[PDB]
């Protein structure tokens, strides 16, 4: 994304479709995502659930809004960083028709389904204002926070490698350590203890 | 494969463009076979940036072991041409 820049001016159609996608991913009432995620949040905040799970799920919806906005910013709202030669074309009908079909979907399909399906479960529909409007509050706060953080990184201060981001930037180190400690043991055991020591020697 | 094919004259024109846009150089005394450190009075720390700009322009990277050997812009053109298999 660092070498993408503004994509509205130079790809308005793809950009609008991408925004629709990010919105549906977030709540954005009455799109496809809403008609599920709303009831998801309601059910979780209206049942005898572990409190930590509830909390981190709400935090994660906020973060959903956050990185959706990260894409929308570093790919659709800043100024170019890509090479100077322009060979852009998004007019081929193979590119536009499927994307716009999927857009019609992302917009109307949740409504359509949720109204055509039979009633499977019983949704709790009487809860405080600060729970029925909580998903939207969460997503909105995420949008605002990411907007502020990015408008800030536009400044001329120097970014640093804070230990709480190197943990995110690096998949939490899970691969960095597991993918080279477990195969190391596996493949060194298979040779030393299994093949040579026993089969070829003992 | 939607990008126009690369041609030598275009490579040379774009290189000289990038160079003219470098404030430590005089467009009037610029041409190929011109040497950065001797004819154009530059130093190695500026040749580094020159090659960086070539990269950011054409969108690929040039290793240091070869970049170190690029002093005449015609050398840059020939390297970019041998890397991208242009022949005309």
């Amino acid at each position: 994304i660092r070498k993408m820049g503004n994509i509205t001016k130079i790809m308005p159609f793809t950009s609008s479709c991408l925004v629709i996608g990010s919105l549906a991913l977030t709540g954005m009432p009455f799109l496809t995502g809403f008609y599920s995620k709303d009831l998801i949040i309601e059910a979780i905040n209206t049942c005898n659930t572990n409190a930590w799970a509830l909390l981190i799920t709400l935090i994660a919806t906020s973060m959903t809004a956050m990185y959706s906005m990260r894409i929308i910013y570093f790919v659709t709202m800043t100024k170019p960083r890509f090479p100077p030669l322009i060979s852009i074309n998004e007019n081929d009908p193979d590119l536009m028709n499927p994307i716009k079909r999927l857009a019609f979907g992302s917009i109307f399909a949740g409504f359509v389904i949720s109204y055509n399906i039979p009633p499977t479960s019983i949704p709790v529909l009487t809860m405080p204002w600060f729970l029925k409007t909580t998903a939207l509050i969460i997503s909105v706060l995420g949008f605002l926070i990411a907007l502020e953080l990015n408008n800030l990184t536009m400044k001329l201060s120097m970014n640093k490698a804070n230990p709480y981001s190197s943990f995110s930037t690096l998949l939490g180190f899970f691969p960095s350590i597991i993918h080279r400690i477990t195969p190391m043991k596996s493949l060194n055991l298979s040779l030393k203890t299994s093949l040579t020591l026993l089969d070829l020697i003992w | 494969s939607d990008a126009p094919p690369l041609t030598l004259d275009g490579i040379k024109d774009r290189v000289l463009y990038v160079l003219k846009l470098y404030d430590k150089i005089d467009p009037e005394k610029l041409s190929v076979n011109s040497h950065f450190m001797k004819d154009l009075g530059l130093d190695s720390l500026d040749q580094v940036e020159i090659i960086m700009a070539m990269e950011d322009e054409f969108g690929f990277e040039i290793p240091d072991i070869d970049a170190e050997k690029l002093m005449c812009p015609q050398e840059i053109v020939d390297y970019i041409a041998d890397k991208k298999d242009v022949y005309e």
Binding site: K9, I10, P12, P84, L85, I86, S87, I88, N89, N91, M96 | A3, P4, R14
Partner: peptide, 15 residues
């Protein structure tokens, strides 16, 4: 069918 421009903003098709 496009015209690949250089350092300039290109024109867009109405479509």
């Amino acid at each position: 069918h496009i015209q690949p421009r250089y350092r300039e903003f290109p024109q867009l098709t109405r479509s």
